[PDB]
Structure 1
């Protein structure tokens, strides 16, 4: 895209503020930002806020979201589709033109770990170029295992293809499959979908802890066989809905856009790989690391 040549829009922080007991404002951007998805490999991503996947959104069950998208892309329209919400797609997930903003309001009625993504046609193109992310909706009544959890992180799986190549997006294997982690609490890492950061800077935990991961496989195209090496998931809540409760799973199958809350115990010090067990994808980047120490700091 000629108007994207040389464009690298600096990341912009997500803006969120609660405006009522059940109402939250969220403002994101759509912007074009260079991301190093593998060493030496820059992808001029189509993004929300200069991150791919985009910034984490967390709201409470029953919050209505008053969402503004500021489209900084000089030429391509963009939009926002939150899987969390009940909305009219043709009214509420509509395009915002370059250099314009749009505001849309819709409720997040359901707890869980939801994909969000750009909804502009061709949706595959917008997702594959980077416009994906997660919104977590916290259950009003929690999860039954909340009191057992010592630490928690968010992980997202996505693929990267040949740059803005619709044929490859439709018909080709992913060039990279990657994890990223998005911060829930101050000091948590906040990374983009790349093949290396969560290997070189593992997530941290302490021996004996029960870890919760909020996970989503945003695709665009692949399913995920999510597995933590050296442990078993004590409890899994499919899509993060507390009712969808499995126990003792070695691996959690996630459809494209599928989410889960998974919990597991790390019993010994060491480094625990986190993979999709579709090992072609793991080999192409989709291995993160959890470093478990006696203290929980590196």
Structure 2
């Protein structure tokens, strides 16, 4: 009887940050209430000033990470304001039935809906828009995110012992297919609808023009680099709603990795690089052992360094010469 369960309202935060939550559940099952507003907006995605009409949940690419526990209910109020031009919906890969909710959440501009579903399987899962007949256009315009369903007793290692993270970040990776003219220059459009047939042709090449973290080339660099300290335990949730990726922490490892994101399985240990299939979220746990700059990349290095799938960590603390040292510095 759901009416007797506690309700808790969560205010979401912008990726790559994650809303406050408890790893080990401090309450019984709850109805966890979220609200998201759909925003179609112009986004500049590279250093050249290339602009697309992005389709977003809550104004960001990716959409925000939602965090609940196994056997909580998720109640999502989804709002499509009348300033938008398209029909949207939402499909949760965490959910059972009705196309993940897509069949029940079709909202025209000026409409809203509220969906509830039970989070029966623990793991990180993709959510994305999926309107009939226009599914990849919405997804590849940025309309995807992820949801994490923690076990009620938190994460465990391969021997069943607790794993506790100190920090968590969410990296959404996005493949974009920006249409090009005859000579290879990117086209611009006044409205999302203008782009539609050119977008289909661009997608059918299967060759993205940009692959980015957090919605733009260089988004997770500089003042927006991810941070940690030596000794900190960090969980990085990574999603890709449409196309395979292979994350790698340059200078580190994935100590414990759930490449396909489902926590009832034991983690893979000591990974250099792992494959997250398109339409999946995964999670990697690492304890930092050295300070400095790290690069976190899709290790198709062309995708990383030419097309945009690279971010940075900046790590503070003490250098350990036992792990690595320069014996003879570069010299003639």
Question: TM-score, length-normalised on structure 1?
Answer: 0.82
Partner of 2:78: 69
For residues 190-218 of structure 1, the C-alpha deviation after alignment (integer angstroms, 9 at most, x for no partner) is xxx21112122210111233322122222
Partner of 2:44: 36
**2:315 aligned with 1:292:** yes
Which structure 2 residues correspond to residues 37-56 of structure 1 after superposition, within 5 A?
Answer: 37-39=45-47, 40-56=49-65
- Give the distance between the partners of 2:108 and 2:96, measured in 1 at CA: 23
RMSD of aligned alpha carbons: 2.3
CA contact (8 A) 1:94 1:119 kept: no
Partner of 1:158: 174
SS in 2 for 1:126: helix
After TM superposition, the structure 1 stretch with the greater mean CA deviation from structure 2, 255-264 or 271-280, is 255-264
Q: Identify the match of residue 228 of structure 2 among 205, 226, 230.
A: 205
For residues 160-193 of structure 1, the C-alpha deviation after alignment (integer angstroms, 9 at most, x for no partner) is 121641111222411111112xxxxxxxxxxxx2
Instruction: Give the drift of 1:43.
Output: 2.1
CA contact (8 A) 1:118 1:127 kept: yes
Q: Provide closer, same or farther for how the CA distance between residues 239 and 147 of structure 1 changes in structure 2, counting only shifts above 3 A.
A: closer
Q: Identify the match of residue 179 of structure 1 among 206, 213, 222.
A: 213
Instruction: Give the drift of 1:147.
Output: 4.0
Higher strand share: 1
Partner of 1:253: 275
SS in 2 for 1:44: strand
- Give the distance between the partners of 1:242 and 1:260, measured in 2 at CA: 13
- Give the distance between the partners of 2:169 and 2:86, measured in 1 at CA: 33
Give structure 2 stretches of 5+ with no counterpart.
1-10, 14-18, 22-27, 180-194, 319-332
Give structure 1 stretches of 5+ with no counterpart.
1-12, 181-192
Q: Provide closer, same or farther for how the CA distance between residues 14 and 204 of structure 1 changes in structure 2, counting only shifts above 3 A.
A: closer
Instruction: Give the drift of 1:22.
Output: 2.2
Question: TM-score, length-normalised on structure 2?
Answer: 0.74
Q: Please tell me whether Structure 1 or Structure 2 has the larger radius of gyration of its CA atoms.
A: 2
